Amino acid sequence: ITGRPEWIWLALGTALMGLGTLYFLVKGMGVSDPDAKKFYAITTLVPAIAFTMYLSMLLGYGLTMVPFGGEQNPIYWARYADWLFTTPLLLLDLALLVDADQGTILALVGADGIMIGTGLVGALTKVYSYRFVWWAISTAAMLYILYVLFFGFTSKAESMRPEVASTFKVLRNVTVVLWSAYPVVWLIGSEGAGIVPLNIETLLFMVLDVSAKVGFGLILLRSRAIFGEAE
Amino acid sequence: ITGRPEWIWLALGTALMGLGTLYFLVKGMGVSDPDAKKFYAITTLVPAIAFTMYLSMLLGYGLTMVPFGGEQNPIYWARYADWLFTTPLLLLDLALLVDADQGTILALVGADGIMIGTGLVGALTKVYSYRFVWWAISTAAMLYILYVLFFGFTSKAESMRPEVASTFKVLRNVTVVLWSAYPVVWLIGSEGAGIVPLNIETLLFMVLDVSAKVGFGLILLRSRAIFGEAE
Amino acid sequence: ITGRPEWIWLALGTALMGLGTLYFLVKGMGVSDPDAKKFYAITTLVPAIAFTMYLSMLLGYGLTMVPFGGEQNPIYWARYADWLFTTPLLLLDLALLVDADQGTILALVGADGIMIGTGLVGALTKVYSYRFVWWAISTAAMLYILYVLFFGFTSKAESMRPEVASTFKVLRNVTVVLWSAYPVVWLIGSEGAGIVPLNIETLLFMVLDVSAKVGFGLILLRSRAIFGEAE
Ligand SMILES: CC(C)CCC[C@@H](C)CCC[C@@H](C)CCC[C@@H](C)CCOC[C@@H](CO)OCC[C@H](C)CCC[C@H](C)CCC[C@H](C)CCCC(C)C
Ligand SMILES: CC(C)CCC[C@@H](C)CCC[C@@H](C)CCC[C@@H](C)CCOC[C@@H](CO)OCC[C@H](C)CCC[C@H](C)CCC[C@H](C)CCCC(C)C
Ligand SMILES: CC(C)CCC[C@@H](C)CCC[C@@H](C)CCC[C@@H](C)CCOC[C@@H](CO)OCC[C@H](C)CCC[C@H](C)CCC[C@H](C)CCCC(C)C
Ligand SMILES: *C/C=C(C)/C=C/C=C(C)/C=C/C1=C(C)CCCC1(C)C
Ligand SMILES: *C/C=C(C)/C=C/C=C(C)/C=C/C1=C(C)CCCC1(C)C
Ligand SMILES: *C/C=C(C)/C=C/C=C(C)/C=C/C1=C(C)CCCC1(C)C
Ligand SMILES: CCCCCCCCCCCCCCC
Ligand SMILES: CCCCCCCCCCCCCCC
Ligand SMILES: CCCCCCCCCCCCCCC
Ligand SMILES: CCCCCCCCCCCCCC
Ligand SMILES: CCCCCCCCCCCCCC
Ligand SMILES: CCCCCCCCCCCCCC
Ligand SMILES: CCCCCCCCCCCCC
Ligand SMILES: CCCCCCCCCCCCC
Ligand SMILES: CCCCCCCCCCCCC
Ligand SMILES: CCCCCCCCCCC
Ligand SMILES: CCCCCCCCCCC
Ligand SMILES: CCCCCCCCCCC
Ligand SMILES: CCCCCCCCCCC
Ligand SMILES: CCCCCCCCCC
Ligand SMILES: CCCCCCCCCC
Ligand SMILES: CCCCCCCCCC
Ligand SMILES: CCCCCCCCC
Ligand SMILES: CCCCCCCCC
Ligand SMILES: CCCCCCCCC
Ligand SMILES: CCCCCCCC
Ligand SMILES: CCCCCCCC
Ligand SMILES: CCCCCCCC
Ligand SMILES: CCCCCCCC
Ligand SMILES: CCCCCCCC
Ligand SMILES: CCCCCCCC
Ligand SMILES: CCCCCCCC
Ligand SMILES: CCCCCCCC
Ligand SMILES: CCCCCCCC
């Protein structure tokens, strides 16, 4: 395990996701409100899935070698397995907060699936120049998602409770900033142009992942917006 | 890319799915009705997914070699990845049109999953005679789906709005004819008996795919059946 | 096929799932009640999926070799493909019976996904001692599911119809006993410590699978709890 310099960040990531999972699990024990239960379920599952995939990367299972540029390049494929399930759960948290219509939710989840799926294909593609074609398609799917979060959701939040409108606005802003960093790190890291070494890349993704999951969850689950308006 | 004679049909397929995706995306921009949004979301996602998988076939990612009959046989596995997601979306379009009950929808999607999954296993099976066992099981799942579309849905459409009944009937008929061709092409093509060469097989699937997705979508999204009855 | 001593149990399993599938399919033909249709759909799909995966194991497709302990160890990976889809369907049968809230259903299905997914990783892991780390995480996800079935569902059933409360209690008890045997068989069988040989392991899983699917389904589909209260 320690044979890879990036192991320290995989281990820290595993620990922080594990701790985040346990914290949300305990916190949600005292919850009976049916609406709050939905948000706790979604939000606890996110770091639990990430915990398993960080562990698989730490132990070496979630790593494969991909030939491109005349080299055997270490590619952590387990990231995409994580993201396939956790990024639509994160979007679902946002969509339920603002009572999004079903068509909009399906558009978001579908675009998200395309985003992660094409990122996976790009990560595993052996023809170097083609990796960036997949990156571009994935990034276009991301831009669609960000567009919807701003010009379909923000003006939906404003007709809702003030506490859900303010909580949505904060989580929207956190999401757009954090999620936009992922394609940049991929592009300059070992999957793309290879300018930033894998150990630093792994650190960067770990900070983004913990912030986008445990950070996000801490903000959401401390808000009164997750509860039905009750006396 | 041009090293494979079937590349021209993969390229045309990619282009037509891409163009179809953009057309539906633009067309649905001016839509606020919650019901119509569902149909636009579902129907736009279908060629978008197909676009990505056609591209993966064009670039060579979605192709593998399978030993059977003492030969290395080129198998485009990306078709099944496409179909796994797009065929239940197509069925969902039909089921929502007639306000199908939840049990019926689950039966359809489940049978569809079995249909595509067993087709994939058959496509990748190395014992030649066993490929046709999987083809038979998949075809039985197809026949179940077609049965339900006729003797569970058609008489559901007739108690609904005339515009939804007439639109459903047309899309049902398009679906049954087009979908029934797929097992025949598989059986006589490079996956099955090998009587029709891969380049012609690829052409045939491209015509079926564009018709079943973009053709289907053009009929559906031009109907007033996708809108709630409103003043 | 007969080259593997466990083939007889794979063949019997295939037959019993096939027969169970046909029986439930015929039985549900005379059903119009929308609630009952849901239970028939879910419950018929379960042995149908299991039939396909038992067949893939019989024909040899669903088997791979995994190096650990200095040996090539036969691992039937198709079990996890089965279980990935059938165990959440089984939980859905239980959850719908007691009209579980959406948050609880998502927690169950999510924990179940983690349970099966980590079992799959453990089954395919090449470092022997690490296989048991994945077994432990999977078992913890199982224990969560069993906890919810007892201390979240049982007291939900009691405020419902007596026929649904009594049917739920029986199916809950069947589920907890049968499902708890699976991690034990894995641990002592060819995936784990290797004390029980593969042919006996295969027998054990076949008895558990038929009981947990066809047995379970026979109890559920003969109950009046699956019908809406109607005059
Ligand atoms: C509604 C939304 C969910 C829409 C989803 C959007 C989605 C369509 C976007 C594209 C997804 C698609 C790229 C998934 C591809 C998975 C694939 C990378 C798995 C690895 O297999 C690739 C090659 C080795 O590189 O296998 C070597 C050759 C092997 C023989 C491969 C044969 C097995 C195939 C992988 C079977 C395909 C199954 C499905 C792709 C399962 C989807 C997995 C998940 C990653 C989407
Ligand atoms: C409700 C509905 C959805 C019901 C669904 C119906 C469904 C049950 C029908 C059968 C689906 C099942 C056949 C999927 C099999 C996928 C498999 C072909 C992927 C390729 O792996 C096959 C061999 C190489 O040929 O791998 C070589 C050996 C490797 C070590 C394989 C180990 C990895 C396994 C593939 C893990 C299994 C994961 C699940 C099958 C994911 C499902 C993928 C999708 C195609 C259904
Ligand atoms: C809401 C709930 C559903 C939550 C779900 C919980 C879930 C997160 C729990 C963990 C699931 C995760 C372990 C699935 C891993 C599948 C993996 C074993 C498939 C086989 O690939 C493993 C190695 C060979 O051993 O591939 C060799 C290297 C290859 C290059 C691998 C590259 C292809 C990757 C497999 C692509 C990943 C796609 C997704 C994992 C699809 C999920 C399949 C299913 C088994 C969950
Ligand atoms: C918890 C993990 C999260 C929130 C991950 C988010 C990841 C993305 C938004 C990834 C986006 C990518 C692209 C837009 C193109 C390049 C490849 C990706 C997959 C890194
Ligand atoms: C957009 C793509 C569509 C509508 C594809 C439909 C495909 C089928 C109905 C495929 C059916 C098959 C069988 C019935 C058995 C042989 C294998 C298949 C998968 C080709
Ligand atoms: C129809 C099949 C059923 C009901 C299978 C149930 C399987 C399980 C509950 C498996 C549990 C496992 C663990 C808890 C850890 C070890 C690995 C598994 C996957 C066997
Ligand atoms: C969105 C953030 C992307 C920028 C990442 C900056 C990383 C700077 C680290 C120094 C680069 C290491 C190069 C020498 C090894
Ligand atoms: C459902 C349509 C299946 C029939 C396809 C007919 C294809 C005819 C093309 C000629 C066959 C090529 C054989 C000589 C290369
Ligand atoms: C939950 C049941 C697990 C116990 C399984 C008992 C199997 C006993 C069979 C005898 C073991 C075979 C060892 C000699 C080959
Ligand atoms: C490819 C995996 C996509 C599914 C991820 C799980 C999250 C799905 C959330 C469903 C949202 C509800 C839509 C109506
Ligand atoms: C194996 C992939 C199956 C899922 C495909 C996505 C479409 C699912 C549509 C869900 C229909 C709603 C059922 C209640
Ligand atoms: C990884 C596969 C998980 C999906 C299995 C299919 C069963 C899903 C049942 C959905 C229950 C409804 C939740 C709201
Ligand atoms: C186009 C929608 C406006 C809100 C999205 C902001 C786009 C940020 C760009 C992210 C950088 C990705 C490379
Ligand atoms: C049995 C249901 C009647 C409607 C379905 C028509 C079946 C068409 C056969 C398709 C050919 C597949 C090989
Ligand atoms: C902790 C919840 C109480 C009900 C679950 C009973 C646990 C049975 C243990 C199963 C054995 C697995 C190794
Ligand atoms: C070796 C790099 C070749 C450049 C490929 C860039 C493709 C980016 C596509 C953006 C439309
Ligand atoms: C393919 C990228 C699309 C980003 C711009 C959004 C187009 C308008 C969509 C309106 C729902
Ligand atoms: C080499 C071909 C052997 C014939 C197999 C046909 C099987 C079809 C099954 C239909 C019930
Ligand atoms: C070779 C076996 C080494 C023992 C591993 C047991 C790990 C079990 C983890 C339970 C917390
Ligand atoms: C509760 C702490 C969980 C941390 C387990 C994984 C950390 C890796 C240590 C090497
Ligand atoms: C908008 C046109 C999209 C076409 C891109 C793929 C066509 C392949 C050209 C070689
Ligand atoms: C209807 C009987 C189904 C049995 C088919 C599979 C049994 C395997 C026989 C070798
Ligand atoms: C993006 C950083 C999130 C910070 C989380 C802090 C949570 C405290 C309530
Ligand atoms: C099956 C062929 C479909 C033809 C689509 C034409 C759409 C015009 C409205
Ligand atoms: C766990 C054993 C189940 C027994 C099923 C018998 C069904 C008869 C109604
Ligand atoms: C990591 C366990 C958290 C302890 C409880 C925190 C207050 C709910
Ligand atoms: C008003 C919300 C500001 C949140 C910005 C957080 C940036 C990481
Ligand atoms: C809305 C601001 C987006 C900031 C992008 C930051 C990418 C590192
Ligand atoms: C391909 C872009 C379509 C242009 C608009 C067509 C009329 C909505
Ligand atoms: C009355 C509907 C006829 C549609 C037939 C289309 C055949 C491709
Ligand atoms: C309902 C008519 C079906 C026609 C099947 C055509 C197969 C090529
Ligand atoms: C296996 C076929 C079952 C025959 C009908 C049983 C009574 C519904
Ligand atoms: C009162 C229900 C008892 C069911 C026990 C079944 C054990 C297999
Ligand atoms: C509730 C009793 C569980 C029995 C476990 C049996 C495991 C073989």
Side-chain angles (χ1 to χ4, degrees), chain B residues 101-104 106-107 110-111 114 118 120-121 124-127 130 133-134 137 144 147, chain C residues 1 25 29 34 37-39 41-42 45 48-49 51-53 55-56 59-61 89 92:
Chain B
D101 66 272
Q102 295 192 355
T104 298
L106 199 87
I114 290 172
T118 53
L120 176 57
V121 169
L124 293 180
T125 282
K126 300 173 182 186
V127 180
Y130 292 169
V133 175
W134 295 107
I137 294 163
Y144 176 80
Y147 171 82
Chain C
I1 274 50
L25 190 74
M29 291 187 65
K37 288 206 282 192
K38 289 167 186 54
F39 291 105
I42 296 175
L45 274 167
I49 290 159
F51 164 81
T52 65
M53 290 298 91
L55 181 62
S56 79
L59 304 180
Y61 184 85
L89 287 176
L92 197 57

Coordinates of all heavy atoms in Angstrom, one line a residue, chain B residues 101-104 106-107 110-111 114 118 120-121 124-127 130 133-134 137 144 147, chain C residues 1 25 29 34 37-39 41-42 45 48-49 51-53 55-56 59-61 89 92:
Chain B
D101 N -50.2 1.9 -14.9 CA -50.0 1.6 -13.5 C -48.5 1.3 -13.2 O -47.8 0.8 -14.1 CB -50.9 0.5 -13.0 CG -50.6 -0.8 -13.6 OD1 -51.1 -1.1 -14.7 OD2 -49.8 -1.6 -13.1
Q102 N -48.1 1.4 -12.0 CA -46.7 1.2 -11.6 C -46.2 -0.2 -11.8 O -45.1 -0.5 -12.1 CB -46.4 1.6 -10.2 CG -46.6 3.1 -9.9 CD -46.1 3.6 -8.6 OE1 -45.7 2.8 -7.8 NE2 -46.1 4.9 -8.3
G103 N -47.1 -1.2 -11.5 CA -46.8 -2.6 -11.6 C -46.4 -3.0 -13.0 O -45.5 -3.7 -13.3
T104 N -47.2 -2.4 -14.0 CA -47.0 -2.7 -15.4 C -45.7 -2.1 -15.9 O -45.0 -2.7 -16.7 CB -48.2 -2.1 -16.2 OG1 -49.4 -2.8 -15.8 CG2 -48.0 -2.3 -17.7
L106 N -43.0 -1.5 -14.1 CA -41.9 -2.3 -13.6 C -41.8 -3.6 -14.3 O -40.6 -4.1 -14.6 CB -42.1 -2.6 -12.1 CG -40.8 -3.0 -11.4 CD1 -40.1 -1.8 -10.9 CD2 -41.1 -4.0 -10.2
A107 N -42.9 -4.3 -14.7 CA -42.8 -5.5 -15.5 C -42.2 -5.2 -16.9 O -41.4 -6.0 -17.4 CB -44.2 -6.0 -15.7
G110 N -38.4 -4.3 -16.4 CA -37.7 -5.5 -15.9 C -37.5 -6.5 -17.1 O -36.4 -7.1 -17.3
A111 N -38.6 -6.8 -17.8 CA -38.5 -7.6 -19.0 C -37.5 -7.1 -20.0 O -36.7 -7.8 -20.6 CB -39.8 -7.8 -19.6
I114 N -34.0 -7.8 -18.9 CA -33.6 -9.2 -19.2 C -33.3 -9.4 -20.7 O -32.4 -10.0 -21.0 CB -34.7 -10.1 -18.7 CG1 -34.8 -10.1 -17.2 CG2 -34.6 -11.5 -19.3 CD1 -36.0 -10.8 -16.6
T118 N -29.5 -10.5 -21.6 CA -29.3 -11.8 -22.1 C -28.8 -11.7 -23.6 O -28.0 -12.5 -24.0 CB -30.6 -12.7 -22.1 OG1 -31.7 -12.0 -22.7 CG2 -30.9 -13.1 -20.7
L120 N -26.7 -9.4 -24.5 CA -25.2 -9.1 -24.2 C -24.5 -10.4 -23.9 O -23.4 -10.6 -24.5 CB -25.1 -8.1 -23.0 CG -23.7 -7.8 -22.6 CD1 -22.9 -7.2 -23.7 CD2 -23.7 -6.8 -21.5
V121 N -25.0 -11.2 -23.0 CA -24.4 -12.5 -22.7 C -24.3 -13.3 -24.0 O -23.2 -13.9 -24.2 CB -25.2 -13.2 -21.7 CG1 -24.7 -14.7 -21.5 CG2 -25.1 -12.5 -20.3
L124 N -21.4 -12.2 -26.3 CA -20.1 -12.4 -25.7 C -19.8 -13.9 -25.4 O -18.7 -14.2 -25.0 CB -19.9 -11.6 -24.5 CG -19.9 -10.1 -24.6 CD1 -19.7 -9.4 -23.3 CD2 -18.8 -9.6 -25.6
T125 N -20.7 -14.8 -25.7 CA -20.6 -16.2 -25.4 C -19.6 -16.9 -26.4 O -19.8 -16.7 -27.6 CB -22.0 -16.8 -25.3 OG1 -22.6 -16.5 -24.1 CG2 -21.9 -18.4 -25.4
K126 N -18.7 -17.6 -25.9 CA -17.7 -18.3 -26.7 C -18.1 -19.6 -27.3 O -17.5 -20.1 -28.3 CB -16.3 -18.4 -26.0 CG -15.7 -17.1 -25.5 CD -14.5 -17.4 -24.6 CE -13.9 -16.1 -24.1 NZ -12.7 -16.3 -23.3
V127 N -19.0 -20.3 -26.7 CA -19.5 -21.5 -27.2 C -20.6 -21.2 -28.2 O -21.7 -20.8 -27.8 CB -20.1 -22.5 -26.1 CG1 -20.6 -23.8 -26.7 CG2 -19.0 -22.8 -25.1
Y130 N -24.4 -22.1 -27.8 CA -25.0 -21.5 -26.7 C -25.4 -20.0 -26.9 O -26.3 -19.5 -26.2 CB -24.1 -21.4 -25.5 CG -23.8 -22.8 -24.9 CD1 -22.8 -23.0 -23.9 CD2 -24.5 -23.9 -25.2 CE1 -22.5 -24.2 -23.4 CE2 -24.3 -25.1 -24.7 CZ -23.3 -25.3 -23.7 OH -23.0 -26.5 -23.2
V133 N -29.0 -20.0 -27.5 CA -29.9 -20.2 -26.3 C -30.2 -18.8 -25.7 O -31.3 -18.6 -25.4 CB -29.2 -21.1 -25.3 CG1 -30.0 -21.2 -24.0 CG2 -28.9 -22.5 -25.9
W134 N -29.2 -18.0 -25.6 CA -29.4 -16.6 -25.1 C -30.3 -15.8 -26.0 O -31.1 -15.1 -25.5 CB -28.1 -15.9 -24.8 CG -27.3 -16.6 -23.7 CD1 -26.2 -17.4 -23.9 CD2 -27.6 -16.7 -22.4 NE1 -25.8 -17.9 -22.7 CE2 -26.7 -17.5 -21.7 CE3 -28.6 -16.1 -21.6 CZ2 -26.7 -17.8 -20.3 CZ3 -28.7 -16.4 -20.2 CH2 -27.7 -17.2 -19.6
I137 N -33.9 -16.8 -25.2 CA -34.4 -16.3 -24.0 C -34.7 -14.7 -24.1 O -35.8 -14.2 -23.7 CB -33.4 -16.5 -22.8 CG1 -33.4 -18.0 -22.5 CG2 -33.9 -15.8 -21.6 CD1 -32.2 -18.4 -21.7
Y144 N -42.9 -10.9 -24.6 CA -43.6 -10.5 -23.5 C -43.9 -9.0 -23.5 O -45.1 -8.5 -23.3 CB -42.9 -10.8 -22.1 CG -43.6 -10.3 -20.9 CD1 -44.7 -10.9 -20.4 CD2 -43.3 -9.0 -20.4 CE1 -45.4 -10.4 -19.4 CE2 -44.0 -8.5 -19.3 CZ -45.1 -9.2 -18.8 OH -45.8 -8.7 -17.7
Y147 N -46.4 -8.2 -26.2 CA -47.7 -8.7 -25.7 C -48.4 -7.6 -24.8 O -49.5 -7.2 -25.0 CB -47.7 -10.0 -24.9 CG -49.0 -10.3 -24.3 CD1 -50.0 -11.0 -25.0 CD2 -49.2 -10.1 -22.9 CE1 -51.2 -11.3 -24.3 CE2 -50.3 -10.4 -22.3 CZ -51.4 -11.0 -23.0 OH -52.5 -11.3 -22.4
Chain C
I1 N -19.9 -29.1 -19.4 CA -20.7 -28.7 -18.3 C -20.6 -29.6 -17.2 O -20.3 -29.3 -16.0 CB -22.2 -28.5 -18.7 CG1 -22.6 -27.2 -19.3 CG2 -23.2 -28.8 -17.5 CD1 -21.6 -26.7 -20.4
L25 N -45.9 -16.3 -13.2 CA -46.4 -15.6 -14.4 C -47.8 -16.0 -14.7 O -48.7 -15.1 -14.9 CB -45.5 -15.9 -15.6 CG -45.8 -15.0 -16.8 CD1 -45.3 -13.6 -16.5 CD2 -45.2 -15.6 -18.0
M29 N -51.8 -13.8 -14.1 CA -52.6 -13.4 -15.3 C -54.0 -12.9 -15.0 O -54.5 -12.0 -15.6 CB -52.7 -14.7 -16.2 CG -51.4 -15.1 -16.9 SD -51.6 -16.4 -18.1 CE -52.6 -15.5 -19.3
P34 N -54.6 -2.9 -9.0 CA -53.3 -2.1 -9.2 C -52.3 -2.4 -8.1 O -51.1 -2.4 -8.5 CB -53.8 -0.7 -9.2 CG -55.1 -0.7 -8.5 CD -55.7 -2.0 -9.0
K37 N -50.9 -6.1 -8.7 CA -50.1 -6.0 -9.9 C -48.6 -5.7 -9.6 O -47.7 -6.2 -10.2 CB -50.6 -5.1 -11.0 CG -51.9 -5.6 -11.6 CD -52.1 -5.0 -13.0 CE -52.6 -3.5 -13.0 NZ -53.0 -3.1 -14.3
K38 N -48.4 -4.7 -8.7 CA -47.1 -4.3 -8.2 C -46.4 -5.5 -7.6 O -45.2 -5.8 -7.9 CB -47.2 -3.2 -7.2 CG -47.6 -1.8 -7.8 CD -48.0 -0.8 -6.7 CE -48.5 0.5 -7.2 NZ -49.7 0.3 -8.1
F39 N -47.0 -6.2 -6.6 CA -46.4 -7.3 -6.0 C -46.1 -8.5 -6.9 O -45.1 -9.1 -6.8 CB -47.3 -7.8 -4.8 CG -47.3 -6.9 -3.7 CD1 -48.4 -6.1 -3.4 CD2 -46.2 -6.7 -2.8 CE1 -48.5 -5.2 -2.4 CE2 -46.2 -5.8 -1.8 CZ -47.4 -5.1 -1.5
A41 N -45.5 -8.2 -10.2 CA -44.4 -7.8 -11.1 C -43.1 -7.9 -10.4 O -42.2 -8.6 -11.0 CB -44.6 -6.3 -11.5
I42 N -43.0 -7.4 -9.2 CA -41.7 -7.5 -8.4 C -41.4 -8.9 -8.2 O -40.2 -9.4 -8.4 CB -41.9 -6.7 -7.0 CG1 -42.1 -5.3 -7.3 CG2 -40.7 -7.0 -6.2 CD1 -42.4 -4.5 -6.0
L45 N -40.3 -11.1 -11.3 CA -39.0 -10.7 -11.8 C -37.9 -11.3 -11.1 O -36.8 -11.6 -11.7 CB -38.9 -9.2 -11.8 CG -39.5 -8.4 -12.9 CD1 -39.5 -6.9 -12.6 CD2 -38.6 -8.6 -14.2
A48 N -37.0 -14.8 -12.3 CA -36.7 -14.7 -13.7 C -35.3 -14.2 -13.8 O -34.5 -14.8 -14.6 CB -37.6 -13.7 -14.4
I49 N -34.9 -13.2 -13.1 CA -33.5 -12.8 -13.1 C -32.6 -13.9 -12.6 O -31.5 -14.2 -13.2 CB -33.3 -11.5 -12.2 CG1 -34.0 -10.4 -12.9 CG2 -31.8 -11.3 -11.9 CD1 -34.3 -9.2 -12.0
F51 N -33.1 -17.1 -12.7 CA -33.0 -18.1 -13.7 C -31.9 -17.8 -14.7 O -31.2 -18.7 -15.1 CB -34.4 -18.2 -14.4 CG -34.3 -19.0 -15.8 CD1 -34.3 -20.4 -15.8 CD2 -34.2 -18.3 -17.0 CE1 -34.2 -21.1 -17.0 CE2 -34.1 -19.0 -18.2 CZ -34.1 -20.3 -18.2
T52 N -31.8 -16.6 -15.2 CA -30.8 -16.3 -16.2 C -29.4 -16.4 -15.7 O -28.5 -16.9 -16.4 CB -31.0 -14.8 -16.8 OG1 -30.8 -13.9 -15.7 CG2 -32.4 -14.7 -17.3
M53 N -29.2 -16.1 -14.4 CA -27.9 -16.1 -13.8 C -27.5 -17.5 -13.4 O -26.3 -17.9 -13.5 CB -27.8 -15.1 -12.7 CG -27.8 -13.7 -13.1 SD -26.5 -13.1 -14.2 CE -27.2 -13.4 -15.8
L55 N -28.5 -20.1 -15.1 CA -28.1 -20.6 -16.4 C -26.7 -20.2 -16.9 O -26.0 -21.0 -17.5 CB -29.2 -20.2 -17.5 CG -28.9 -20.8 -18.9 CD1 -29.0 -22.3 -18.9 CD2 -29.9 -20.2 -19.9
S56 N -26.4 -19.0 -16.6 CA -25.0 -18.5 -17.0 C -24.0 -19.2 -16.2 O -22.9 -19.5 -16.7 CB -24.9 -17.0 -16.8 OG -24.6 -16.7 -15.5
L59 N -23.7 -22.9 -17.8 CA -23.1 -23.0 -19.1 C -21.6 -22.5 -19.0 O -20.9 -22.6 -20.0 CB -23.9 -22.1 -20.1 CG -25.3 -22.4 -20.3 CD1 -26.0 -21.5 -21.3 CD2 -25.5 -23.9 -20.7
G60 N -21.3 -21.9 -17.9 CA -19.9 -21.6 -17.6 C -19.5 -20.1 -17.8 O -18.4 -19.7 -17.6
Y61 N -20.5 -19.4 -18.3 CA -20.2 -18.0 -18.6 C -20.0 -17.2 -17.3 O -19.2 -16.2 -17.2 CB -21.4 -17.3 -19.4 CG -21.1 -15.9 -19.8 CD1 -20.4 -15.6 -20.9 CD2 -21.6 -14.9 -19.0 CE1 -20.2 -14.3 -21.3 CE2 -21.4 -13.6 -19.4 CZ -20.7 -13.3 -20.5 OH -20.4 -12.0 -20.9
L89 N -35.2 -5.9 -5.0 CA -36.6 -6.2 -5.3 C -37.3 -6.9 -4.2 O -38.5 -6.6 -3.8 CB -36.7 -7.1 -6.6 CG -36.4 -6.3 -7.9 CD1 -36.3 -7.2 -9.1 CD2 -37.3 -5.1 -8.1
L92 N -38.0 -4.3 -1.6 CA -39.1 -3.5 -2.1 C -40.5 -4.2 -1.8 O -41.4 -3.5 -1.4 CB -39.0 -3.2 -3.6 CG -39.8 -2.1 -4.2 CD1 -39.6 -0.8 -3.4 CD2 -39.6 -1.9 -5.6

